[PDB]
From Swiss-Prot, chains A, C:
EC category: hydrolase
Lineage, top ranks: Bacteria, Pseudomonadati, Pseudomonadota, Betaproteobacteria, Burkholderiales
Protein species of origin: Paraburkholderia xenovorans (strain LB400)
Task performed by this protein: Catalyzes an unusual C-C bond hydrolysis of 2-hydroxy-6-oxo-6-phenylhexa-2,4-dienoic acid (HOPDA) to produce benzoic acid and 2-hydroxy-2,4-pentadienoic acid (HPD).
Pfam families per record: Abhydrolase_1
Residues forming the catalytic site: H262 (proton acceptor)
NCBIfam families: biphenyl_bphD
Site (Transition state stabilizer): S109
HAMAP family: Biphenyl_BphD
Pathway where it operates: Xenobiotic degradation; biphenyl degradation; 2-hydroxy-2,4-pentadienoate and benzoate from biphenyl: step 4/4
EC number(s) on file: 3.7.1.8
GO molecular function, one term: 2,6-dioxo-6-phenylhexa-3-enoate hydrolase activity
Protein activity control: Inhibited by 3-Cl HOPDA.
Reaction(s) this enzyme catalyzes, per UniProt: 2,6-dioxo-6-phenylhexa-3-enoate + H2O = 2-oxopent-4-enoate + benzoate + H(+)
Protein name: 2-hydroxy-6-oxo-6-phenylhexa-2,4-dienoate hydrolase
Length: 283, 285, 283, 285
């Protein structure tokens, strides 16, 4: 199982959304789990969830790694509203076009920002809500912000290089000698091959200061069943936010992996797969 | 054999470190990889009472399950302790393993039993498999919660003035959803208090000799090599939630799981999630 | 200096506010500091700030311990909106009638809920903002709620007795053998002499679940200069909230007394007087 | 005499515990009740550099102010330490008091100096007056912040590869408002690095012998009887804010003050508030 190889594109037409194409990787048959990737230079469905797609499939799942608008092999965009809203409107839209009643959502960081927005707007279109170190949520009660990884992320968006990209990924892992070439090079290329995307993301953050993403006062509204996951060592979104989530989502559980950076799903792939499949199978 | 409190009920004498032909009450079913479950420290606590919603599912998953009554609780022998209970309780757990020919056991510990499970991994690293913690005590001050917490000290009020009403108040504070309480649980804790009044009095004497602060093993948590699963009820009014980060940060190989809408007793109030999550951890972590 | 003795009443006429009288204690000349008391059975300006009034005056201040509506020797009321709003509308109204341009506000708990509401609505009518263990602010990230003291407070509102009142005050102090007769009996009497107030407060909490008080999403708006104080051992409002405050008020400082219950101003009167007078004189 | 870095500049030999005719650089003005100020642990730190915005106001308030250069920083003697620096630095503070006939001193400690101030109150309870802490290190893991924090380890990068640019990056991370930085502060830290290159190398050697974890005195905080004033910058990217609750909870008589919009250096970035608040505390607490 690979990329190319699960490679699938699809034109979508929701809200303010004339013929816009989304690339995404897909596989298996079943109940539908969509995986939403993080917000940083050269992030896709496949780079973010390439360690998870197989196990989740080997488990009776129809899995779609989504390329959210303005990312990897999707179609470039500039937004005037928070990418959480927009991005989600895009989801409600890949569903409709692939004709899909309900999905399970797994959302990393910006992904998690999306997944939450989707649950807010499209309450009847979502199965179970899995949040992994999700972005947006206001200030930490303990971390100075911008956090180290946000500062590295904007560094990378503004002046992209390979040296600065490694710098970034090392901050992204607890154990940084886990960095592989597959990971490094994959991202290095959605960067090379989609330069328009770096430029467009900053402009959008110009229109939409990342403080505009804050769903907090509206968290009381989420009816979906939520699993909040976090790496103990997240240098990118703060830990205490899993608690913010925990106390504000009617039906939530928190799990925190130790010795794990921002990406629980890649760095703690095994436990992550297990915990989530299991949550999906039985919660 | 059908699995009931009496059908599982057993006794063994232990002879570890100053225990000498000291009688341990426990409840045992299943066969194979051993899981010993260690109960909390309130009046009338016992293995069966803390863990009767967990024992069947753990046995059915292929474990041999031991619900041990610590020294000075329930049907075990009485004792006035002049040392911290977590360490004393951990010698007793070793003593029971020795007597029963058990080389290594996974530990599930609630509160005083989480304290006890921590000391056991510190003192006998070679006798432990996995370590499961469920709002353990023995962990010092909280960075947020004024102490003694509410639960604590309904606990102490109940030890000094045992009454049926204070017992109900205490148990309710253990729960997020107070209506889940049953008259039978209550009556079970109440019989255990009434039929062993000496344990309450010996508890208070023991605590004078060795206040709760002497149970704090924070400075040694870095020695724990057991793979660790810490669990907390979000709504625990007995031991503070930030202690689950304390463990998460201070033990080498830990992970933490918080259940929402859950008092102190996650294994009882969320038995089903708890059983499923801890069984998986045992099998695959 | 005493009660009676600073005793002053005054009819007020703001928003939905036909001739309503407020009792309040007053003294000295100067810049105006209004002190707003907490939300529990038999709480006034004088019982709450009787340890502070003298020092603050001895320091060149015109001090007014305000009886917020539906409390002590004021006029009973039932509210359909959060007492923070309402209570503040009352402030904007005692000012106008005593003809007062600007005030310094010190607000304990419900007081603090008020003081904050006043800063939100009447941004040009307030000097410096002193918050002491202020109420309302959403859920804690660490304390189970209702907190112990809230549960005792509602206990006392619903079935008032002297036994339950002592129970309550002991939870209110870190060191509870500091309880005096002046304190005990003062409260025991706004209880006896204002039974209508117990009844009316519950009804209001009926219309206005204390979760309606949450100013949080609007904290970015406060332009006043704020001093957040808390007792380390507050069993009534959570500690972590001084951090919520700290991170969301443009100009804030946090101070936390140790070995101190909910009432820093009474239990740590000396340091409290000093810290606040000093903040008032020089921040 | 006018109060300038050189007009205050002095040396004394100390002979405490294995220090023997070891030369301490310090900056001193004023007379009376003594306040000793203990600087942090980054490359090029010294008493004057950490505290030149505080010394005039403390002297003017009626204190005798001592800005001490710890062993192996700035103009003090060089040293490779095989023990934790906080304890070693605290013996040196005692040695300087002894040599100077000072019976008791109030301590203000920043970071490594907060660590140093803690050890000093533990080891010599009778030689301390009040204890003022300003984001002290020596306090173990954080319950929220991944470690090493950002600041830490620009600190270590700068110790191993001293450069003017990494120095600027480091100092900026110390600040909430990065533009408050001055070329003269920078140039002062840079001269101190260049003129005593051995201190950086001896620092890294010392830390190999005694990692930062050996500086953690959390288990003994309960012995501190000094009346304590802990202060933190909200925005400290060098030592974690939750450690200010750790102290607040674990020291008998403490209070905590957090300045908003403030990096690690509250005494510099909020000098004025800091000076006023710490002076009052000294006078009236």
């Amino acid at each position: 199982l690979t990329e190319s190889s699960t490679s699938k594109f699809v034109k979508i037409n929701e809200k303010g959304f004339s013929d816009f194409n989304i690339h995404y990787n897909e596989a298996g048959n079943g109940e539908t789990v969509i995986m939403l990737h993080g917000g940083g230079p050269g992030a896709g469905g496949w780079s973010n969830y390439y360690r998870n797609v197989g196990p989740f499939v080997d488990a009776g799942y129809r899995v779609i790694l989504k390329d959210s608008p303005g990312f990897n092999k999707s179609d470039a965009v500039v937004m005037d509203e928070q990418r959480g809203l927009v991005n989600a409107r895009a989801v409600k839209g890949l569903m409709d076009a692939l004709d899909i009643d309900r999905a399970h959502l797994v959302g990393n960081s910006m992904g998690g920002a999306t997944a939450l927005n989707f649950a807010l707007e499209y309450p009847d279109r979502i199965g179970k809500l899995i949040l992994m170190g999700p972005g947006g949520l206001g200030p930490s009660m303990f971390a100075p912000m911008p956090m180290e990884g946000i500062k590295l992320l904007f560094k990378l968006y503004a002046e992209p290089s390979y040296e600065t990209l490694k710098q970034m990924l090392q901050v992204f892992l607890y154990d940084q000698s886990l960095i592989t070439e597959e990971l490094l090079q994959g991202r290095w290329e959605a960067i090379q091959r989609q330069p328009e995307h770096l430029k467009n993301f900053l402009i959008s953050a110009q229109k939409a200061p990342l403080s505009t993403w804050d769903v907090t006062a509206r968290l009381g509204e989420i009816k979906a069943k939520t699993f909040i996951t976090w790496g103990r060592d997240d240098r990118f979104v703060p830990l205490d936010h899993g608690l913010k989530l925990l106390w504000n989502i009617d039906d939530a559980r928190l799990h925190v992996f130790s010795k794990c950076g921002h990406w629980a799903q890649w760095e703690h792939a095994d436990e992550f797969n297990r915990l989530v499949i299991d949550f999906l199978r039985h919660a």
